[PDB]
Amino acid sequence: XLLVTAGLVLA
């Protein structure tokens, strides 16, 4: 996917 997390980034 198009995200901005801190640690577990997924599609």
Helix boundaries (H) for 1-11: none
CA 11, distance to chain mean position in Å, is: 7
Contacts of 10 by beta carbon, 8 Å cutoff, 6+ apart: 1, 3
- What tokens does 6 get? 């801190």
Structure-determination approach: NMR
CB 11 within 8 A of CB 1: yes
Where do we find the tokens 């980034």?
9
- What tokens does 8 get? 């577990």
